[PDB]
Amino acid sequence: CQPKPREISNLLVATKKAQEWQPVYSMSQLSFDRILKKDIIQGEHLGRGTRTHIYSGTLLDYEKKIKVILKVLDPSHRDISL
Amino acid sequence: NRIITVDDKTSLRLHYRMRFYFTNWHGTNDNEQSVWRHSPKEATPLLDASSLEYLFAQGQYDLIKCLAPIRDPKTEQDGHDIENECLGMAVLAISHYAMMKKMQLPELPKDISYKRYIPETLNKSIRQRNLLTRMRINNVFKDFLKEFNNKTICDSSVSTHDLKVKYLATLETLTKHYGAEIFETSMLLISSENELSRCHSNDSGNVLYEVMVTGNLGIQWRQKPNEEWNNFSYFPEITHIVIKESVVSINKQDNKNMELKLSSREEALSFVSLVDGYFRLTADAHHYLCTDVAPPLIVHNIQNGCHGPICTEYAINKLRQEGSEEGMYVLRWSCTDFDNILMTVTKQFKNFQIEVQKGRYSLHGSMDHFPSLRDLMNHLKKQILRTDNISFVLKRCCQPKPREISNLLVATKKAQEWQPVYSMSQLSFDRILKKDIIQGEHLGRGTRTHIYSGTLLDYEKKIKVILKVLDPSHRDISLAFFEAASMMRQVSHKHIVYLYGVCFRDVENIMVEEFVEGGPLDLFMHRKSDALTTPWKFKVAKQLASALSYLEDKDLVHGNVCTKNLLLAREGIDSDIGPFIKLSDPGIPVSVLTRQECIERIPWIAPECVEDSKNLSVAADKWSFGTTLWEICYNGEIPLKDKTLIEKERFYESRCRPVT
Amino acid sequence: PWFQGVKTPRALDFSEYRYPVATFQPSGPEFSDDLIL
Amino acid sequence: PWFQGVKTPRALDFSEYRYPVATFQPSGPEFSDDLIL
Numbered sequence: 001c002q003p004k005p006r007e008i009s010n011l012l013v014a015t016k017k018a019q020e021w022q023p024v025y026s027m028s029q030l031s032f033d034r035i036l037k038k039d040i041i042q043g044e045h046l047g048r049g050t051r052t053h054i055y056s057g058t059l060l061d062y063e064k065k066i067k068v069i070l071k072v073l074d075p076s077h078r079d080i081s082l
Numbered sequence: 083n084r085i086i087t088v089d090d091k092t093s094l095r096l097h098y099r100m101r102f103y104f105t106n107w108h109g110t111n112d113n114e115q116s117v118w119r120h121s122p123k124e125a126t127p128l129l130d131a132s133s134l135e136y137l138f139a140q141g142q143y144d145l146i147k148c149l150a151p152i153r154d155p156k157t158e159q160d161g162h163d164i165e166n167e168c169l170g171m172a173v174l175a176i177s178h179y180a181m182m183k184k185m186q187l188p189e190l191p192k193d194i195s196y197k198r199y200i201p202e203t204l205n206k207s208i209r210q211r212n213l214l215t216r217m218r219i220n221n222v223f224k225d226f227l228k229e230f231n232n233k234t235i236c237d238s239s240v241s242t243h244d245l246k247v248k249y250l251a252t253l254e255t256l257t258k259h260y261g262a263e264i265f266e267t268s269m270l271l272i273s274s275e276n277e278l279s280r281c282h283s284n285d286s287g288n289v290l291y292e293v294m295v296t297g298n299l300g301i302q303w304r305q306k307p308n309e310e311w312n313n314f315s316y317f318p319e320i321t322h323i324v325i326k327e328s329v330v331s332i333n334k335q336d337n338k339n340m341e342l343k344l345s346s347r348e349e350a351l352s353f354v355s356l357v358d359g360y361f362r363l364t365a366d367a368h369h370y371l372c373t374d375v376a377p378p379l380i381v382h383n384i385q386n387g388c389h390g391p392i393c394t395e396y397a398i399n400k401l402r403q404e405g406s407e408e409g410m411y412v413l414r415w416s417c418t419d420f421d422n423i424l425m426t427v428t429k430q431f432k433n434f435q436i437e438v439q440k441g442r443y444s445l446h447g448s449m450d451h452f453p454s455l456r457d458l459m460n461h462l463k464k465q466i467l468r469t470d471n472i473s474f475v476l477k478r479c480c481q482p483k484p485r486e487i488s489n490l491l492v493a494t495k496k497a498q499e500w501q502p503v504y505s506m507s508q509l510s511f512d513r514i515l516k517k518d519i520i521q522g523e524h525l526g527r528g529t530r531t532h533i534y535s536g537t538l539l540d541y542e543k544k545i546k547v548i549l550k551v552l553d554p555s556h557r558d559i560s561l562a563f564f565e566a567a568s569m570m571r572q573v574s575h576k577h578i579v580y581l582y583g584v585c586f587r588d589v590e591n592i593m594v595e596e597f598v599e600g601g602p603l604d605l606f607m608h609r610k611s612d613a614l615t616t617p618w619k620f621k622v623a624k625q626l627a628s629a630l631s632y633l634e635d636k637d638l639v640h641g642n643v644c645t646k647n648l649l650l651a652r653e654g655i656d657s658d659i660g661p662f663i664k665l666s667d668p669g670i671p672v673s674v675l676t677r678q679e680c681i682e683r684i685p686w687i688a689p690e691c692v693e694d695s696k697n698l699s700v701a702a703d704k705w706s707f708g709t710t711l712w713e714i715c716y717n718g719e720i721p722l723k724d725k726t727l728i729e730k731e732r733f734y735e736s737r738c739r740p741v742t
Numbered sequence: 743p744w745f746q747g748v749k750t751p752r753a754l755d756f757s758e759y760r761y762p763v764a765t766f767q768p769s770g771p772e773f774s775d776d777l778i779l
Numbered sequence: 780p781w782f783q784g785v786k787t788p789r790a791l792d793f794s795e796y797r798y799p800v801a802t803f804q805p806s807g808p809e810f811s812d813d814l815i816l
């Protein structure tokens with residue numbers, strides 16, 4: 001067995017400043033931001049990825065009229081939504 | 083609200099004092115967080131300039147007259163140091179008087195003597211000592227005065243306003259438990275009604291206790307020594323207070339209770355008034371806790387709808403949120419005059435002044451008058467108003483909202499933690515792996531939802547749960563499903579069911595919920611119709627009200643408050659133990675329902691939601707609670723049955739009263 | 743005993759100052775004339 | 780000047796104490812005997 005990067009042990013010394021650099025725990029939380037369907041505008045086709053389709057698009061009222069890329073999961077592969 | 087009667091024989095003497103106090107209002111002491119009023123989008127100072135002078139005089143009188151207790155020493159060194167600091171305080175006060183008199187120390191030394199500026203007990207103690215010490219302390223006082231009156235004033239450029247805050251800050255720490263009131267009693271009961279517990283804490287011993295209330299900490303109690311205090315609650319956590327003769331009861335949001343006895347009714351009222359006053363300063367300025375101590379002005383404001391002495395910017399901002407349509411207006415008391423009300427009407431924002439005199443109301447610039455403010459408003463409603471080139475008609479008034487933030491409220495460190503969190507667009511929930519659940523038999527069908535029994539493994543082990551599955555044919559509303567699941571994650575109350583998480587399995591989505599074996603309250607009310615008693619019904623209503631209040635405080639909305647969503651955890655019919663109920667999940671929102679399905683929820687669904695679904699807000703719950711109260715008292719009888727859909731619509735349209 | 747010790751009071755110094763709120767500035771117009779339909 | 784002032788050093792009092800780690804306790808067995816296939 002071999003050591004691992006940033007492996008915690010009694011060799012390390014804890015300090016207040018270094019306390020903020022510790023990683024956060026997200027073992028099972030799923031969190032994301034919702035965008036309302038009225039703020040996006042779908043554009044032309046750009047190509048196909050791995051079971052994914054890509055279109056150009058524009059986002060409104062986030063300045064205004066900003067250009068973005070839209071990636072859509074294929075309809076026939078919804079089982080992998082997780 | 084105490085009534086004072088004079089009948090040519092009574093004689094009494096009173097004092098006009100500042101009662102409510104917050105410690106460390108000044109920012110001098112950096113060891114603790116300061117306090118400040120809220121401001122519209124530095125921090126506003128708490129006290130006005132005029133009030134500070136009277137507070138200074140009150141503090142000086144308290145110190146000199148020995149009404150407040152002076153701290154006792156812990157050794158000889160600090161025993162002399164406290165006397166030294168008191169002499170310094172006397173120096174500060176006499177220097178303030180000399181400066182305000184606009185004359186120097188040598189100009190008027192005739193009336194100078196430090197005896198009139200120390201607590202009487204300390205003066206008596208010194209008088210019993212040797213003459214040489216008296217001469218030496220006189221010399222020290224004179225030298226200190228001479229030094230401060232010439233060197234410090236130019237060294238620091240201290241003004242008349244500068245010394246008062248230092249005086250008050252020093253008195254805050256030189257005095258024992260300053261700015262607090264403490265009560266003594268021989269009996270004290272603390273109760274809690276956790277599930278199947280009903281823990282009657284405390285004992286029947288003869289020991290005595292003490293209760294202390296302060297602005298920055300709340301309510302604390304302990305046994306009187308022959309020990310550190312233990313915290314009971316802070317002001318925003320209280321719900322209501324009730325007086326039984328001379329016994330005071332305090333009730334919290336988590337159903338915890340405190341009950342204690344005082345000397346007499348006067349003491350009970352004095353105790354209740356302090357807490358009721360603090361609640362308005364810290365929690366909400368448009369509410370009162372106990373009916374027995376309600377000030378008349380707050381009652382008048384609640385009946386009519388006038389705001390307090392709020393700032394103009396807040397009033398302007400409120401009108402903008404309502405679309406700024408012509409005819410809407412806001413009433414608020416003038417910030418300077420005790421008899422004028424500023425009707426702000428709306429783009430344009432015109433002001434008007436209403437004069438109030440000896441109970442007679444009349445608009446400024448007219449001779450006709452009315453005996454009631456509401457009457458004056460009603461008369462003014464139907465006329466057409468003229469100002470410059472524009473004419474308009476008033477249509478509707480704006481009203482305050484619960485826990486509305488304004489400059490009336492006071493911010494503190496303790497109250498800072500009670501502020502709501504922002505979750506405007508975040509959707510968050512916990513994932514459950516498909517291998518940990520086991521699906522059971524069918525249990526029935528809900529609104530576009532199927533329910534199955536099930537078991538959860540390795541969370542103890544082999545725990546029983548309820549599984550709710552969205553219908554396959556209605557996957558378009560998956561956003562509502564996720565929103566409901568996210569909402570249920572934030573709540574934590576003993577009368578609401580617990581949500582374990584959501585499990586993803588192929589295309590299906592599953593919600594995992596606690597299992598309550600008593601079943602819906604509706605069926606139990608149906609079967610045990612004859613055995614029910616009045617206290618049972620009141621106990622049922624109280625818990626539902628408490629849960630809805632908790633939901634209101636966090637600004638969440640539950641759209642299906644009905645009897646079908648009440649689950650029995652304990653029947654309590656057999657013996658003294660009361661029933662226990664829990665409130666289910668919100669379910670499918672009304673926003674995705676058709677026109678016809680909105681009709682069938684009459685009279686549970688609010689009318690403004692029938693008019694337009696986007697109008698949903700927290701106020702819709704208070705209608706469903708009223709309907710549910712009627713449903714309870716008649717053994718679960720179906721309200722407004724046998725009416726067709728068109729008749730139900732006519733009921734809402736004609737503004738008729740549905741049930742009595 | 744006390745004659746051997748001379749020390750200035752600790753509370754007689756000042757630092758960082760303080761300030762209350764001054765007042766609100768009065769203001770109010772009036773142009774009210776009424777008519778009846 | 781200084782003869783009129785006598786005060787004990789502020790650092791000569793003690794409170795709440797302190798403590799370092801003592802040591803690690805030595806321990807180790809050995810039962811090694813080797814064989815070849």
Ligand SMILES: Nc1ncnc2c1ncn2[C@@H]1O[C@H](CO)[C@@H](O)[C@H]1O
Nearest residue numbers: 525526596597598599601602649666
């Ligand atoms: N949230 C819930 N908690 C416990 N049991 C429930 C819940 N929803 C439905 N049930 C059960 O479903 C059946 C009626 O639909 C009853 O057995 C009832 O206990």
